[PDB]
Each structure stands twice: as structure tokens, then as C-alpha cells.
């Protein structure tokens, strides 16, 4: 890797600088280099990794959706044939997105997940694995589409099983996992009832545990609970 010659601590410091400069591609490259040092990541380092790649892939997804919309409109009735360019460029963005997802999944498989023994780290990584298979599923059309969807579901389900055994219902990682798995059910698995049930049950069980929290933990938990309520409002 081009980051192989840079100190782990310097990669982490530069990822933080890249975040302040809103240079998310750089941030992701620095965090990939840090993961490839082979040591486990701390909680803050896991956040830097996730923020970097979520922003890179989020921009790719937004661009893909714009291009896919144009492509679908170009393929309707009465639409003037514009040639292969819209499809080619949507495919170009799609292949770039798939490459980023494969990179993240590769870091998780080699070897972040297998060394993650505490619930905070293991649930976070398994959630990321579900997330990046979900982004692959958003663009998938081939023989492997169902397997991609099932890979997302399986990673989310393992994360859920650990989170319910090992974390309180207000833990922000448990809440964020449930938020994203609920979105998976709604958008990917064509299971809106499962999406709604999961979001509502997660919200209600968190509400009943807020009394145990400090003011700062309360702020963290209620922030994610509001996202669950926002999605429930969109869907009901």
C-alpha cells in the first residue's frame, strides 16, 4: 500500500486533518493505511474509519442515483435515443462504488472482524459489513444479487444477536445498527413491516432505559432515537 511507509500515529493524525478539511477520499486512504498496520482499532479510530468511507460511498451513491434516474428516463417511451453514454457513465460510477465497498469489506475480513472480541468493536464492524453489502445490493442486478442481499442480512443479524445480549438498549451502536438494519428491511429486502417493527421496538426499548443514563449519554442515545422516529414518520 502507498501508506505502508507512514507511521500508524501519523496516518491517524492525518485522517483527523483530512476530516477537518472535508477531504474524505484522503481520510479513507489514511484510515485504510492505519488498518493495514495490523493492530486493532480504538473506538475513536473505528469512528474515523467509518466516517471516511461513509462519506466517500455516500457521494458515490448520490451520484449513482442521479445517473440512474437519467438513464431510466432515457429508456422510457418517446425518449430520444442518446447513445450508450448515460449507461456507460452510470456503470463507471457504479464500478467505482463497488470497488470502495470491496475495499471496506476486505478490511473487515482481513482482519478486523476476526480480532474483534468486545461487543463495541465486533457489533460496529459487523454493522459496517451489513452496510457495505447493502450498498452493493443497491446496485446489484446479476446472478449474485440474492447472495449479496443475504450477506448483508447475515452480517446485520449477527451484529443484532450480539448487541441484544451484550449492550443496553440505549447503546448508540446498538441503536445505529437497528436503524440501518431497519432501512435494509425497508429498501433492500422489500420487508416494510419488519422495518417498521424493528424501528418501533428499538425506539420503545431505548426510551425505557434512558432513565439510567447521564446527561451526555442521554444526548447520544436520543440523537439516534430521533432518526428512528424520523424513519417511522416517513414510513407510516
Amino acid at each position: 500500500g502507498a501508506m505502508g511507509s507512514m507511521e500508524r500515529a501519523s496516518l491517524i493524525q492525518k485522517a483527523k486533518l483530512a476530516e477537518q478539511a472535508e477531504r474524505y477520499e484522503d481520510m479513507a486512504a489514511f484510515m485504510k493505511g492505519a488498518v493495514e498496520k495490523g493492530e486493532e482499532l480504538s473506538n475513536e479510530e473505528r469512528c474515523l474509519l467509518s466516517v471516511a468511507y461513509k462519506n466517500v460511498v455516500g457521494g458515490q451513491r448520490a451520484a449513482w442515483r442521479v445517473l440512474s434516474s437519467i438513464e431510466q428516463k432515457s429508456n422510457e417511451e418517446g425518449s430520444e435515443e442518446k447513445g450508450p453514454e448515460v449507461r456507460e457513465y452510470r456503470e463507471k460510477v457504479e464500478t467505482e462504488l463497488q470497488g470502495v465497498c470491496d475495499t471496506v469489506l476486505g478490511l473487515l475480513d482481513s482482519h478486523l472482524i476476526k480480532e474483534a472480541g468486545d461487543a463495541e468493536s465486533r457489533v460496529f464492524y459487523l454493522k459496517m459489513k451489513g452496510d457495505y453489502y447493502r450498498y452493493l445490493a443497491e446496485v446489484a442486478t446479476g446472478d449474485d444479487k440474492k447472495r449479496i442481499i443475504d450477506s448483508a442480512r447475515s452480517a446485520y443479524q449477527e451484529a443484532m444477536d450480539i448487541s441484544k445480549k451484550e449492550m443496553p438498549p440505549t447503546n448508540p451502536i446498538r441503536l445505529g445498527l437497528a436503524l440501518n438494519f431497519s432501512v435494509f428491511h425497508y429498501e433492500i429486502a422489500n420487508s416494510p413491516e419488519e422495518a417498521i417493527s424493528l424501528a418501533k421496538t428499538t425506539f420503545d426499548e431505548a426510551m425505557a432505559d434512558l432513565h439510567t443514563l447521564s446527561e451526555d449519554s442521554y444526548k447520544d442515545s436520543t440523537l439516534i432515537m430521533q432518526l428512528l422516529r424520523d424513519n417511522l414518520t416517513l414510513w407510516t
Partner: peptide, 6 residues
């Protein structure tokens, strides 16, 4: 459109 994810 994007429902919320984190």
C-alpha cells in the same frame, strides 16, 4: 431519497 442511516 435517503431514510436516515448512521
Amino acid at each position: 431519497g435517503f431514510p436516515a442511516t448512521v
